[PDB]
Symmetry: C5
Subunit: 269 residues, 5 copies
C-alpha cells in the first residue's frame, strides 16, 4: 500500500500547485533550505535504522541456519557413536523434526497440534502442548532419549556430553529467536520515523512549489518514493518471522530440515 501514499502525494502536490496563487495573500512562505536540513536529517536516521533492521533479519536467518547444522551433527554423532541403535535414531529424529516445526509455530503464533500429531505418539503430544514452552519440552524429551542410553551404559559420560552440547546449541537458537520475536527495535523508532517520513513527504510539495511550480508533483513523488521505499523495507526486515514478502520462508526451511534428517536416517518421503 506504498502506492497509495505515492498517489496521495501526487494529490498534495496538485493542492500545492492550485493554492500557490493564494500564498502571498495568506502570508505563507516556504523555501527549500529548511526542508533540505530536515530531509537530510531524516535520511541519516533512516540509514542507521535500516541498518539495524537488516542486522536483526540476518541474525534470525543465522539462528535458523544453526537449527539445521546442530540437528545434522546430532544425527551424525548418533550414527557414528551408536550405529546399531536405530530405534533411538528414529525417536530422536522425530523430536528434532518436531522441534523445528514447533519453533516455527511459536514464532508465527500458530497451533502446532497437527504437526506434532503427524510426528509423535499422542501421549507425548499432550505432554508437549501442556508446557508454556513446547519447544523447550521437546528438547527435554530428546534429552531423555540420550539420558536413558547413558543409564543403560550405551553412552559413556563423554559421548553423552558430545550430544548434550547439541541440545545446548538448540536451546541457544530457541532463546535467540524468542529474543528477536519479543524484541522489536524499540517502537519509538518507527513511531518517530513512520510519522516523520510521512509528514515530511506531504509537506514537501508546499515547500517545492515556489521553485518548481508545475514540476512539483514529479520531483515530490520521486523524493517521496525514495524515502518511503527505504522506510517500508526496514519495517519488513524488522519482523523476520512474519508473513510479508521479504520475511523468512520458515515453512520451506522446516521442510528442508525434515528432508535432511530423513535423508540421514535411511528413510524416504
Amino acid at each position: 500500500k506504498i502506492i497509495f501514499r505515492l498517489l496521495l502525494n501526487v494529490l498534495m502536490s496538485i493542492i500545492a500547485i492550485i493554492s500557490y496563487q493564494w500564498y502571498e495573500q495568506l502570508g505563507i512562505h516556504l523555501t527549500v533550505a529548511p526542508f533540505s536540513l530536515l530531509g537530510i536529517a531524516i535520511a541519516i536516521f533512516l540509514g542507521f535504522r535500516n541498518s539495524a533492521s537488516y542486522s536483526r533479519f540476518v541474525e534470525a536467518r543465522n539462528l535458523w541456519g544453526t537449527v539445521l547444522i546442530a540437528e545434522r551433527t546430532l544425527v551424525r554423532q548418533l550414527r557414528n557413536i551408536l550405529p546399531a541403535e536405530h530405534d533411538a535414531h528414529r525417536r530422536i529424529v522425530s523430536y528434532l523434526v518436531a522441534f523445528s516445526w514447533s519453533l516455527k509455530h511459536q514464532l508465527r503464533k500458530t497451533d502446532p497440534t497437527a504437526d506434532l500429531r503427524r510426528l509423535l505418539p499422542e501421549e507425548r503430544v499432550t505432554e508437549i502442548l501442556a508446557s508454556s514452552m513446547p519447544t523447550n519440552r521437546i528438547l527435554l524429551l530428546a534429552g531423555n532419549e540420550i539420558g536413558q542410553l547413558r543409564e543403560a551404559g550405551k553412552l559413556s559420560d563423554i559421548t553423552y556430553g558430545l550430544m548434550d552440547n547439541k541440545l545446548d546449541e538448540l536451546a541457544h537458537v530457541l532463546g535467540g529467536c524468542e529474543r528477536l520475536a519479543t524484541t522489536p527495535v524499540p517502537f519509538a523508532y518507527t513511531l518517530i520515523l513512520q510519522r516523520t517520513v510521512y509528514l515530511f513527504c506531504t509537506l514537501l510539495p508546499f515547500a517545492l512549489v515556489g521553485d518548481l511550480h508545475y514540476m512539483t508533483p514529479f520531483v515530490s513523488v520521486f523524493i517521496s518514493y525514495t524515502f518511503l521505499s527505504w522506510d517500508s523495507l526496514a519495517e519488513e526486515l524488522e519482523d523476520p518471522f512474519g508473513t510479508a514478502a521479504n520475511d523468512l520462508p520458515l515453512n520451506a526451511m522446516c521442510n528442508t530440515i525434515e528432508r535432511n534428517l530423513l535423508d540421514m536416517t535411511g528413510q524416504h518421503p
Copy 2:
C-alpha cells in the same frame, strides 16, 4: 519533551514579533549556517544512537542467556539425574532467585520479598548479608551441584557439563554489572543533549527571515525530529536505569520461573 516543543513555539512567536528590530541593531541569522550546524548534529546523533542501540542489544542478549542457561541446566539435571527431585527443587529455587535478585540489583530495588518467597530464611539471611547477593546465589547453586558430585551421583564429566552453565550465568552477572555502572561517556552526553536544545531554540530565529508566519510550524517539526532522536538514544543507553521500562525485565523473570516450574512437574495442578 512536549514542554520544549511548546517552548519552541513560544520562541517562534518571539522571533516573529521581534524580527522587526533586527536591522536597527545589525543582527542577522541565515539558514545556511544552521543547516551546517543541524546536519553535523544529526550525524553525531546517528553515531551516538548507534552506540546506545548497541548497549540495548547487549543487555537483551545477556538476559536471553539467563533464560537459555537456566533452562538447559534444569534439562541436564532431569536427563542425568531423573530421580533426584529434592535436588531439582532446591536448584530451581536458586536459579529463580538468581534472576529476580539480578533484576532487583540492576533496578536498585529491594530483593527481600522475592528471596523470602523462594528460599529458606537461613539462606536469605546469608544472601542479604553479602555485599554481592547475586554472586552468593550462584555460589549456593554451585554447592548443590558440588554435593551431588561428592555423593557420587555426578561424575567429574557430568559435573563439568552443569558447571559450564553456572559459568554462563557468571558472565551474565558481570556483563550486566558493567552495563549498569556505565555509561561509557563521562556525562559528556549532557553537553550533547544541551547542544540539541540550544539548536532547537535558536532555530526559529534563523528560519523566520525565510518562513515568516510559517516559522512555528516548520520550526517545531524540525525540533520534534531532533528531540525525539535524542531522547530515544537516552532511553537506549540506559536499559537498566532509573527511568526505564520494567515490563521486559519483569516478563523475563516471570517467563523463566514459569518454564522451570513446568520443567519440574510443579505445573500443571495435579
Copy 3:
C-alpha cells in the same frame, strides 16, 4: 562493465537538456538544484549503508572458506599426532576432507562434482554420495564414519574421538553458513529500490543542472553519475561471492590450496 553505456546515455541526456532548455518556460517546467541535492545526498547515504552490507556478506563468505582450510589442517594434524601409525586411516580421511571442499565448491557454483569426486574416491562411495540430495553433508557423515570406526576399534578413546568430532562440527557450520549465503541473498528489494532510484536520478539530473551549468552540464553530470554508478555496481559484485565474476572468490584456487596442504601434511 556495461556502465560505459549508461554514462554515454547520460551524456546524451545532457545534450538533450541543453537543446531543450529553450522550451522550458514555454512548457512551465522549472528545475532547481536544491531539491536534487536533497535527493542525491539521501541516495548516497542509502548506497553507503547498502554497500556496507554487501561487503560484510562477501567477508563472511571468505571467512567460512578460511575455516575449511583451518579445520581440515587441524583434523589431519590431530590424526598424525594421535595416531601416527594409522596411515590407511589418514589417507581415507584426507580424501574425504578434500572431497568435501570440492563438493562444497561445486554445490555453490551449481556445477557437476563428479570428476573431482571420482578423482578422490572409489566409485563405490561416489555413487552413494551422488545418490543423496545433500552430497556434501553425506561426505561429512562418511568422514565421521572413519573416525567412529577408529573409536570402535579402540584406536581412539572417547576423549580423542571428541577432539576430532569437534573439527567435523566446525565443517558442518561452514556447510550450513555457505548454504545460507547461497539461498538467502541480500534482499532483492535493496537492488530494485536502488537501481531504479540511482538510474532515474542520474538521467533527471542534467535537466536540473542545465539552468545553472548550461554548456558545462554534461561534464559535471557524467562525473556525478559515474560516482554513484561505480559505487552501486561495486555492491553488485560483492553481493555474489560464490559467482564466476573476476571479483568473486577464487574458489578453484582455494580448493587447490586445501588439497595441496593436506597432501603436504601426509607425505603425499
Copy 4:
C-alpha cells in the same frame, strides 16, 4: 576543560572578522558559507567514524577488566564446590588471583607493584614474580602451579583440573588484550589529520560567517565551534582508558571490588 581557550580564541577571531570585513572587497577576498558547509560536513563524517573507533577501544578495555572479575569469581566458586575442605589451597589461590589484578593495574599504569604484592604473598614468591620481565604473566604461572599440585596430589582429577585451567586461560586473554590495547592506540594519523582540520576549520569559520551574520557572528560561530570541539574532545577522553584522569577507568576501585568479592566468597 581547555576547550574554553579555543572558544575564547574563536570569539577574538569573530571580532577581527567583524572589524576587518571592511577591507574584504579592497583586497578581493570573499568567504561564503557553502564551501564551509561541504568542508564541515566531511569533517563531521570523519569525526563520527573516528569517535566510533575510540569508543570501541574504551569499551573493550572495560570488557577485559570485567572478565577478570568473572573468571576469578568462578575459579573461586569451583575451588569451593569441588574442594570444600581445602581452605589453605583456597587462600593461596585467592592471594594469587588478587595479586594478578593489582599487578595488571600497576603494569598498565607503569607503577610499582611491590607493596601490593608483599601485602598478599610471601617474600619468596614476590622475588620470583619481580625477577620476571613479565611479572603479571608469571603470577598466572604460580596460580597454575597451585592447581597443578592439587592435580598431582590426586585432589583434582584431570577433568576438574581442566575446568579450572580454563579460567586461567580467560585471564591470559585479558592480560594479552590489555597489553595489546596499551601498545596499540587508535592510529596517530587519525588524530593528526582530525586535529589539524578541526582547529583550522573553527578559526576560519567566523571569516566565512561574517558576510551573512555580521554582529551575530561571534555567537553562532562559537556555537558551531563548541559543537565540533566537544565531539572531538570526547575521543580524547575515551582514548586513555588505563590512565588516572577522572574520565579514565577507576582501576583502583575495580581492583578493590575484585579483592572484596573474592574475600566475600572465602569467609574472610
Copy 5:
C-alpha cells in the same frame, strides 16, 4: 605520503581558476558550488565507509597477532604446570612456537625465513620446514608431534593432551585468519573508483569555488583537498596491515616481544 604533490598541484589549479574567471562567459562555462557540494558529500560518505572497512581489517589483524602471544603463553604455562620437570620438551616446544611467529611474519612479508629458522632450530628440522609449501603449518605439525610423543610415552593423558591440543588449534586459526587477510585485499575496484574520483574532484573544485571565493580560492580549495586526500590515503595504508608503511603493524617488534616472553629468563620457571 605523496599527498604534498597533489596539494601543491591543487594550489596551481586554483590560480588558474582565479585568472580565468573573467573569461568564463567568453567561453560559455558556468560553474556553481551546489553541484560540487552534492558530489563532495557523496564522496565523503563513501570515503567514510571505506576507511571504516580498512580500519576493521587492521583491527582484526592486530587481534590475530595478539592471540599468538596469548595461546603460546598458555601452552607454555600448561607444559610447566602439568609436566614441570620435562625441560627438554619445554625447550623443543618453545623453539617451535618462536619459529612459528617469525615464520608467520616472513610469510606475510614475503621475505626469506631461512636465517630465523637456523637460529632457532637444528638444520635437519630447518630443511623439513623449508621443503614444505606451507612452512608455518609444518611448524605447527612439529610442535604437535612433541605433544603427541609426550602422550604416547604416558606423560600426558588424553585429557591433558587435549588441553594443549586446543592451543595449537587456536594458532591454526591465527594462521588461517592472517592468510585470508593477506591473500585477499579489499577489492581492487575500491582503490580504483575512489582514487580517481577523489583526485578529479579536488582538481575541478577550485573552478567551481572561484565565483564565490575569488582570491581566497587557493586556501579553501587546498584545505578541502587535504581533508579528502588524507582520509583516502590512510585507508589505503590500513587495508594492508602487514605492509611496511608507518600506520601498519610493527610485526618485527611483535615477534621480538613473543620471543622475549617465551624465553624470559633462560626458560627458567618455578
